[PDB]
Structure 1
Amino acid sequence: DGAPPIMGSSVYITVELAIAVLAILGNVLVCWAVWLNSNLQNVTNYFVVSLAAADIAVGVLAIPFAITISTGFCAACHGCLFIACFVLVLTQSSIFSLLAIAIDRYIAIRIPLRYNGLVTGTRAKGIIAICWVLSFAIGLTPMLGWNNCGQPKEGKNHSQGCGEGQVACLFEDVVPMNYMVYFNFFACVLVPLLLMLGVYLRIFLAARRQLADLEDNWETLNDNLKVIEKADNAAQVKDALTKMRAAALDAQKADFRHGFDILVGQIDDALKLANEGKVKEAQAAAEQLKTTRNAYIQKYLERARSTLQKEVHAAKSLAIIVGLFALCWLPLHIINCFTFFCPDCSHAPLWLMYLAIVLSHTNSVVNPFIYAYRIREFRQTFRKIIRSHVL
């Protein structure tokens, strides 16, 4: 019978409302930016908007629900559940959006060739609708009978003076911890997180191998070239050109058709000279390759390299989003593991719980900062919106 609970409550409520303000405003800005900047209207950013929608709803609904449930007010058992579990629906929706973004970027880097034919806005819209419906079904599963409404706290319900059937609106009293640990954490959160880790691993490895391939083809072009200038045999020259020719048309698979046709044509010219024993003609006809290389091949192998670099830098930016999600949500999941798995442990203290709850809510405010910071197109669009509207 120490400090009045209203004092602790005041800090918690004030902080929660400060978070709600920032989650709403920042994520409204993201949606506004995607709405009037056609450079941002792609499939990838439709999942960004779905993710922003979930974070707006955290400020508008989940946080007010969190404040309400903290009071332990007397209400319907299934009413409490909805208040208690709605945040999950939003958290699950966030998981699906993050997973979809990963797969989208994976498809884009491995088969850029058939990316626009496979991944369309119409199909993305259908994927998003389905994921929202699945998120409701997963998040509100306790309302289907997996709850403690059948086992009410006799003592608490009489202390608070609830009516008949009514019950305080506690979180750990109505939502079973085996649902939270096994179903929600392990299956619905941790498994998708590990899948996202895997997808991003492949993204970075695919980028690393492609770059390499081009570097190998580029060095193959120039070495076989230097072998040409020193050889003394007709077949010695013909060997370095057939190997230079394979590397020519393979680098071609990674306006510019002209650059590669002059190159491969010049190699074939030098080939028939070599076959007819005309060594010095072959060596001199192969020496004009280096100006075709310096006027086309070099120009395309820098441009392909900078495109891959941008895809890597973009993938890193999106991976940070997933990292901060895990950082904000793992403490709460870990606390629940201790509650569930260690009955010999005294329960984590109230101040720590609420610190972990506050931390999970702040994850819906760092997003917009990552965007404007990591992605130029977002930053420039926010700049314009801020400077124009409503000034």
Structure 2
Amino acid sequence: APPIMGSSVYITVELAIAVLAILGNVLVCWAVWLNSNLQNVTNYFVVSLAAADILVGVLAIPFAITISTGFCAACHGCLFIACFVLVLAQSSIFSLLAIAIDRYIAIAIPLRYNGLVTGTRAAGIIAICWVLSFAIGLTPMLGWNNCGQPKEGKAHSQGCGEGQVACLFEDVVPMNYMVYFNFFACVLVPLLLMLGVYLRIFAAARRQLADLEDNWETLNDNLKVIEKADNAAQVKDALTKMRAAALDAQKADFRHGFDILVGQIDDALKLANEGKVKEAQAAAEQLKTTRNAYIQKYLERARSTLQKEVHAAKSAAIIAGLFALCWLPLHIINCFTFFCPDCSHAPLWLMYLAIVLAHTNSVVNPFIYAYRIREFRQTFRKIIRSHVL
């Protein structure tokens, strides 16, 4: 078949992806700009990620279409066309890693979060990561390239000028760079890092949920103990273990609820020390009202916050996971090309599918926010509804 037919399918799909990438990610940026409830440090990395995905539609996909033709070009110009997408992919990895660390700090040291993680510091991190993304993605331009060993047969067969090559990705970008440097070091290692961070996030959330439940059962168990104890030392032992358990919970109207609880325990405790057991039990039984009134509400709000954080972190993890799914095939095909030179090159149609799937990643982020985060979903509706209506 004439190549122009298969290439017409490839180009049409690439342009379709470019349109979806631009529209969806413009909506993400628009949403964060308008809605103050979306303006947090976490979402500044989301916007940086959306900007990279817009750039895939506006620049990388047109570059990808161009380099598929093998057009004649100065090798360093070709290199820039071939490698710019690597800058955007690297920026996305830094943004994904930053989001994971952000959510980890939020769950592990909430008290210190807003003091550590600020808009000003985030903006600085985003600027540094973009600079590093240019350095990593355009490393071939610094001399790690095959511009020095041009394919002269292809150059003259295609009728290129001198100094010019048939501009093809695999002719100009070295496969050792793509496999060892780009894939293993700059992509795979950060992805495994994010896996580790997210693991630590879910473990932290699970431990804090358990601790909450433990304090609640420990406050309820020791109550029953006091109600059935026939000795003043039994009441004292239990009440001392409730005071500790209450003071851990305090740190972990609610602020008043705790002062009442500690006070009522201190009351029932001084009675117990004086031998007044029935009076200690009577004083201990008022804790039920403080528990019903205040403690049960603080337990349930704190449980609600942790669950919201587990949801947000799962949402972020899906986006990191989707990046991996969409990019691994292209990276794995490169590994086969590099490591198995006795293996037939992956056919053109599968190369096209791998490239298109990597580009498709720049579409998916907006759907995940829409499906998994109400605050974005609501703002999407309002930006669409107030432009339709």
For residues 390 and 69 of structure 1, the distance between their equivalents in structure 2, rounded to whole angstroms, comes to: 38
Deviations 1:287-345 (A, max 9, x none): 11101100000010000000000000010001000010000000000000001101110
- Provide the residue aligned with 2:305 in structure 1: 307
Indicate conservation of the 8 Å contact 1:254/1:304, yes or no.
no
Residue 235 of structure 1: how far off its partner (Å): 0.3
Indicate conservation of the 8 Å contact 1:34/1:40, yes or no.
yes
For residues 165 and 115 of structure 1, the distance between their equivalents in structure 2, rounded to whole angstroms, comes to: 55
For residues 366 and 24 of structure 1, the distance between their equivalents in structure 2, rounded to whole angstroms, comes to: 11
Q: 2:52 aligns with which of 51, 54, 66?
A: 54
Residue 91 of structure 1: how far off its partner (Å): 0.3
- Provide the residue aligned with 1:247 in structure 2: 245
For residues 141 and 155 of structure 1, the distance between their equivalents in structure 2, rounded to whole angstroms, comes to: 27
Indicate conservation of the 8 Å contact 1:48/1:97, yes or no.
yes
Q: 1:123 aligns with which of 87, 104, 121?
A: 121
Deviations 1:167-212 (A, max 9, x none): 0001100010000000000000000000000000000000000010
Deviations 1:144-188 (A, max 9, x none): 000001111121111101111110001100010000000000000
4+ runs of 1 displaced by more than 2 Å? none
For residues 212 and 361 of structure 2, the distance between their equivalents in structure 1, rounded to whole angstroms, comes to: 40
Indicate conservation of the 8 Å contact 2:76/2:141, yes or no.
yes
Please tell me the root mean square deviation across aligned C-alpha atoms, in Å: 0.6
For residues 104 and 347 of structure 2, the distance between their equivalents in structure 1, rounded to whole angstroms, comes to: 42
For residues 122 and 182 of structure 1, the distance between their equivalents in structure 2, rounded to whole angstroms, comes to: 35
For residues 44 and 389 of structure 1, the distance between their equivalents in structure 2, rounded to whole angstroms, comes to: 27
Residue 253 of structure 1: how far off its partner (Å): 1.3
Residue 96 of structure 1: how far off its partner (Å): 0.4
For residues 315 and 252 of structure 2, the distance between their equivalents in structure 1, rounded to whole angstroms, comes to: 24
Indicate conservation of the 8 Å contact 1:227/1:240, yes or no.
yes
For residues 28 and 114 of structure 2, the distance between their equivalents in structure 1, rounded to whole angstroms, comes to: 24
Residue 254 of structure 1: how far off its partner (Å): 1.5
Q: 1:163 aligns with which of 155, 161, 164?
A: 161
For residues 124 and 323 of structure 1, the distance between their equivalents in structure 2, rounded to whole angstroms, comes to: 23
Indicate conservation of the 8 Å contact 2:67/2:81, yes or no.
yes
For residues 255 and 42 of structure 1, the distance between their equivalents in structure 2, rounded to whole angstroms, comes to: 27
For residues 20 and 271 of structure 1, the distance between their equivalents in structure 2, rounded to whole angstroms, comes to: 70
Residue 275 of structure 1: how far off its partner (Å): 0.5
Indicate conservation of the 8 Å contact 2:253/2:294, yes or no.
no
2:208 alignment partner, SS class? helix
For residues 350 and 390 of structure 1, the distance between their equivalents in structure 2, rounded to whole angstroms, comes to: 42
Deviations 1:51-71 (A, max 9, x none): 000000000000000000000
The normalised TM-score by structure 1 is: 0.99
- Provide the residue aligned with 1:383 in structure 2: 381
Structure 1 residues without counterparts, runs of 5 or longer: none
Deviations 1:195-248 (A, max 9, x none): 000000000000000010011110000000000011111101110100111101
For residues 129 and 369 of structure 1, the distance between their equivalents in structure 2, rounded to whole angstroms, comes to: 26
For residues 330 and 190 of structure 1, the distance between their equivalents in structure 2, rounded to whole angstroms, comes to: 9
Indicate conservation of the 8 Å contact 1:34/1:45, yes or no.
yes
Structure 2 residues without counterparts, runs of 5 or longer: none
Residue 390 of structure 1: how far off its partner (Å): 4.6
For residues 105 and 257 of structure 1, the distance between their equivalents in structure 2, rounded to whole angstroms, comes to: 26
The normalised TM-score by structure 2 is: 0.99
Indicate conservation of the 8 Å contact 2:100/2:198, yes or no.
yes
Indicate conservation of the 8 Å contact 1:66/1:84, yes or no.
yes
Figure out how many residues of one structure are paired with residues of the other and give that number. Answer: 389
2:212 alignment partner, SS class? helix
Indicate conservation of the 8 Å contact 1:76/1:167, yes or no.
yes
1:286 alignment partner, SS class? helix
Indicate conservation of the 8 Å contact 2:70/2:166, yes or no.
yes
For residues 257 and 38 of structure 1, the distance between their equivalents in structure 2, rounded to whole angstroms, comes to: 28
Residue 255 of structure 1: how far off its partner (Å): 2.8
1:75 alignment partner, SS class? strand
Sequence identity (%): 98
Query: What does 1:1-391 correspond to in 2, within 5 Å?
Result: 3-391=1-389
Residue 38 of structure 1: how far off its partner (Å): 0.2
